[PDB]
């Protein structure tokens, strides 16, 4: 195992990660970030 | 009256891939192939570049 700087939050009774990877990945590239999907109404 | 049930489920894999490209120019390819060597003090810098 290795020590890694990463935030951990508590939701309900479960300890989960909370990652928002937009600077480590998808920064200064030519690809669009997912989770910005569209809807049709 | 009820009897206990057993379930059997089977899933299969799905195959994908990744691709990335890498290019070298014609001048760099000519320098790396050690063809037309001349002026060994001025072409060594271009080969190192």
């Amino acid at each position: 195992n290795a020590r890694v700087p990463a935030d951990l939050v508590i939701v309900g009774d479960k300890l989960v990660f909370l990652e928002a990877l937009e600077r480590r990945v998808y920064q200064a590239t030519r690809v669009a970030y997912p989770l910005i999907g569209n809807i049709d109404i | 009256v009820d009897q206990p049930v057993h379930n059997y489920m089977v899933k299969r894999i799905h195959k994908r891939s990744l691709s990335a490209a890498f290019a070298i120019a014609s001048e760099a390819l000519s320098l790396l192939s050690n063809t037309y060597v001349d002026g060994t003090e001025i072409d060594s810098s271009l080969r190192i570049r």
Binding site: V25, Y26, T29 | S19
Partner: protein, 49 residues
């Protein structure tokens, strides 16, 4: 009264610039700076180039 003298280094605006001394500035016709910036790459598949 006596004036309160201001030095540029003690001001908070000195953090916004890199001052440097250059005596032969009157002889400089043109001075340039250069940048070499590279960018990362993500790898994908499917109907993409």
């Amino acid at each position: 009264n006596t004036l309160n003298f201001v030095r540029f280094l003690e001001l908070g605006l000195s953090v916004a610039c890199i001052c440097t001394k250059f005596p032969e500035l009157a002889y400089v016709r043109d001075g340039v700076i250069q940048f070499e910036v590279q960018q990362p790459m993500i790898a994908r598949d499917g109907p993409h180039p």
